[PDB]
Write an enzyme that holds these catalytic residues in place. Structure first.
Site, mmCIF file in Angstrom:
data_model
loop_
_atom_site.group_PDB
_atom_site.id
_atom_site.type_symbol
_atom_site.label_atom_id
_atom_site.label_comp_id
_atom_site.label_asym_id
_atom_site.label_seq_id
_atom_site.Cartn_x
_atom_site.Cartn_y
_atom_site.Cartn_z
ATOM 1 N N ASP A 33 -1.205 0.433 -4.466
ATOM 2 C CA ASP A 33 -2.149 -0.580 -4.926
ATOM 3 C C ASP A 33 -3.455 0.008 -5.447
ATOM 4 O O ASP A 33 -4.299 -0.745 -5.942
ATOM 5 C CB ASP A 33 -2.444 -1.588 -3.807
ATOM 6 C CG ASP A 33 -2.957 -0.934 -2.543
ATOM 7 O OD1 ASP A 33 -2.625 0.249 -2.300
ATOM 8 O OD2 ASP A 33 -3.687 -1.614 -1.786
ATOM 9 N N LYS A 78 -11.910 -0.659 -0.755
ATOM 10 C CA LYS A 78 -11.822 0.764 -1.056
ATOM 11 C C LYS A 78 -11.207 0.951 -2.437
ATOM 12 O O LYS A 78 -10.273 0.241 -2.819
ATOM 13 C CB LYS A 78 -10.997 1.502 0.003
ATOM 14 C CG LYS A 78 -9.914 0.677 0.679
ATOM 15 C CD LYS A 78 -9.078 1.516 1.625
ATOM 16 C CE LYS A 78 -8.082 0.652 2.375
ATOM 17 N NZ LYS A 78 -7.526 1.351 3.559
ATOM 18 N N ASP A 104 -2.302 5.565 -3.960
ATOM 19 C CA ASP A 104 -1.254 4.791 -3.317
ATOM 20 C C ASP A 104 -0.799 3.671 -4.253
ATOM 21 O O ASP A 104 -1.265 3.546 -5.389
ATOM 22 C CB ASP A 104 -1.734 4.240 -1.975
ATOM 23 C CG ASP A 104 -2.972 3.385 -2.104
ATOM 24 O OD1 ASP A 104 -3.481 3.241 -3.235
ATOM 25 O OD2 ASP A 104 -3.437 2.867 -1.068
ATOM 26 N N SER A 149 0.815 -1.209 0.000
ATOM 27 C CA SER A 149 0.000 0.000 0.000
ATOM 28 C C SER A 149 0.852 1.265 0.000
ATOM 29 O O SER A 149 1.322 1.703 -1.055
ATOM 30 C CB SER A 149 -0.947 0.002 1.203
ATOM 31 O OG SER A 149 -1.938 -1.002 1.073
ATOM 32 N N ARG A 198 -6.399 3.687 -1.920
ATOM 33 C CA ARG A 198 -6.498 4.959 -1.219
ATOM 34 C C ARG A 198 -6.310 6.106 -2.205
ATOM 35 O O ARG A 198 -5.707 5.949 -3.270
ATOM 36 C CB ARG A 198 -5.459 5.047 -0.099
ATOM 37 C CG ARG A 198 -5.655 4.030 1.019
ATOM 38 C CD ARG A 198 -4.560 4.157 2.071
ATOM 39 N NE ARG A 198 -4.888 3.472 3.322
ATOM 40 C CZ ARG A 198 -4.549 2.218 3.614
ATOM 41 N NH1 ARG A 198 -3.869 1.479 2.746
ATOM 42 N NH2 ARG A 198 -4.894 1.701 4.786
HETATM 43 CA CA LIG Z 1 -3.429 0.574 -0.047
HETATM 44 NA NA NA Z 2 -3.249 -1.307 2.937
#
Ligand SMILES: [Ca+2]
Ligand code: NA
Length: 561
Positions: free
Chosen positions: A291, A390, A289, A118, A294
């Site tokens: 991956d 998310k 981010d 992340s 976010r």
């Molecule tokens: Ca992440």
């Molecule tokens: Na994460």
């Protein structure tokens, strides 16, 4: 021509406890600590029921960080030797966490393995991580977490097919005949964006968004993928499909080390984006981010959209999105440390709100039982039931859709929102890599004070600002689906002056203490105040009462947001 199944003797590791966002270690641990990757992978696989594991399908992806392509090679080998029937993998190993969730749900895979840390830096000197998602597409529940830890603590051997080799560069199938197995172990290298893109087509009005990013009145946007996984996603979706100029895509070439930068969307590590949004040329700015789950959002002149505000503003304007026009809205959810701004929106438009512990996995049961349609966290996370994770780009497209409908700019919406519902001033302090023992004894000593029989009748004074304690406890959550109770989910001090303080302990390889401060104000005239002045005191209360500086020997927070 068969591929043998080899069982390797191994000895267990004691630290393979998966965190809320997977198992994160320095790349060296996975790459040099022998049988470390294999032990954990086998544990993830053994947590799957033996019956259900045969012939099932799993999705594998990564953010492109260093060692991913090696981790995948071992994943397919051990997957095959453990009876898995098929692995769906992203082209070149690239598959964002939202896309992995979307694939698991579409093909009805048993789960997925995501190679990413992340917000952490990648590369030989950087960090590495392994996240495991289950059948519903969300992160592994607590049950699975404990199961993986239990197996990792007792693992004596693991199965693997060392003679197996895979090419991620060219899309298509790669069938492998394993020994004592009729059906061929399949490996599908799929397009990284296609399936995920088609999910978005049914959610948003791509004509509406395309028109906003096009024409003489076109919006000037800068999207910083931070050289992570979301590079090709914005290029193919925002630029190629939705017609945004090529210069809108920034750091969209996935790099093993992310160009040597931190992929942590916020006012601290996304300085490259904030600098351009300060120039004043761009009306919209966004950073993802590593991956792609976010997302930070910025208005003109680096207007910072607080993620708690972003969640509430979007909730209040979901009518702009076809997805929610048709299916409606069944409920809202937010992690407990997230500001109560959404609660305002919900009480207005008559919708339920769930206060869950930090961690997206706690949103799974609410969506799976139809109780929640839309949710997010102060940790730059937002999403709906289109998947069970998310989703960053979903958030951008959501904001672009609300902007094309409102016919306004970012700051215009947010301030308008503050006038109609009041402003929830909010901020978070992070104390990273602090001594785990001191962090622990800090939190229980603090809990002892918070839990005192006479604490609720205490008042705290900073200058002329007085904060009278209303209720304080250690947060506890009862799952409404299975009735399971989650304890030690964050200390809370609720003052009877429209203010909160939250203290959260999470995981050098040390501990992290995060302090959240919230203060609500009704009057729109006092909405121009500086957050440092509104929230300055509350933090001063938090610092004295916790004594985190002397306890941890720190002079200031590692990060402020
Ligand atoms: Ca992440
Ligand atoms: Na994460």
């Amino acid at each position: 021509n068969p591929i043998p199944v080899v069982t390797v003797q191994t000895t267990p590791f004691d630290d393979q406890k998966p965190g809320t966002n997977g198992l994160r270690k320095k790349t060296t641990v996975f790459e040099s600590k022998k049988n470390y990757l294999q032990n954990y992978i086998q544990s993830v696989l053994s947590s799957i029921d033996l019956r259900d594991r045969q012939g099932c399908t799993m999705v594998v992806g990564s953010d492109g960080r260093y060692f991913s392509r090696t981790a995948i090679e071992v994943i397919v080998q051990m997957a095959a030797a453990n009876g898995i029937g098929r692995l769906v993998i992203g082209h070149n190993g690239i598959l964002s966490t939202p896309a992995v969730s979307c694939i698991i749900r579409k093909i009805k895979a048993i789960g997925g393995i995501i190679l990413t840390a992340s917000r952490n830096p990648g590369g030989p000197n950087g960090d590495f991580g392994i996240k495991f998602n289950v059948a519903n597409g969300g992160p592994a529940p607590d049950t699975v977490i404990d199961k993986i830890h239990q197996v990792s603590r007792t693992l004596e051997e693991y199965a693997i097919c060392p003679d197996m080799r895979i090419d991620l560069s060219r899309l298509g199938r790669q069938d492998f005949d394993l020994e004592n197995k009729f059906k061929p172990f399949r490996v599908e290298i799929v397009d990284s964006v296609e399936v995920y893109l088609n999910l978005l087509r049914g959610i948003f009005d791509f004509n509406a968004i395309k028109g906003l990013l096009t024409g003489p009145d076109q919006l000037k946007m800068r999207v910083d993928a931070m050289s992570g996984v979301m590079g090709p996603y914005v290029r193919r979706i925002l630029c190629d499909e939705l017609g945004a100029p090529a210069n809108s895509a920034v750091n969209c070439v996935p790099l093993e080390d992310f160009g040597g930068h931190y992929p942590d969307p916020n006012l601290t590590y996304a300085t490259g984006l904030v600098d351009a949004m300060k120039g004043g040329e761009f009306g919209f700015g966004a950073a993802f981010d590593a991956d792609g789950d976010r997302c930070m959002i910025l208005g003109q002149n680096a207007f910072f959209v607080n993620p708690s505000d972003s969640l509430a503003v979007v909730a209040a304007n979901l009518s702009c999105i076809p997805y929610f026009r048709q299916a409606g809205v069944r409920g809202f959810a937010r992690s407990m440390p997230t500001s109560t701004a959404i609660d305002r929106v919900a009480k207005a438009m008559k919708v339920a709100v769930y206060e869950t512990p930090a961690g997206w996995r706690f949103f799974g049961n609410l969506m799976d039982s139809g109780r929640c349609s839309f949710c997010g966290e102060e940790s730059f996370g937002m999403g709906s039931d289109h998947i069970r994770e998310k989703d960053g780009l979903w958030t951008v497209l959501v904001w672009l859709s609300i902007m094309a409908a409102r016919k306004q700019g970012v700051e215009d919406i947010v301030r308008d929102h503050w006038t109609k519902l009041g402003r929830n001033y909010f901020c978070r302090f992070d104390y990273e890599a602090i001594d785990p023992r001191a962090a622990f004894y800090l939190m229980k000593d603090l809990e002892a004070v918070i839990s005192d029989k006479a604490f609720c009748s205490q008042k705290f004074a900073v200058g002329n600002s007085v904060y009278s304690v209303e209720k304080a406890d250690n947060f506890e959550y009862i799952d409404p689906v299975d009735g399971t109770v989650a304890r030690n989910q964050g200390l809370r001090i609720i003052f009877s002056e429209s203010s909160r303080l939250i203290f959260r302990l999470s995981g050098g390889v040390g501990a992290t203490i995060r302090i959240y401060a919230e203060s609500f104000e009704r009057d729109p005239e006092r909405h121009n105040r500086e957050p440092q002045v509104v929230l300055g005191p509350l933090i001063a209360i938090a610092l004295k009462i916790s004594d985190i500086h002397e306890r941890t020997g720190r002079r200031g927070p590692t990060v402020i947001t």
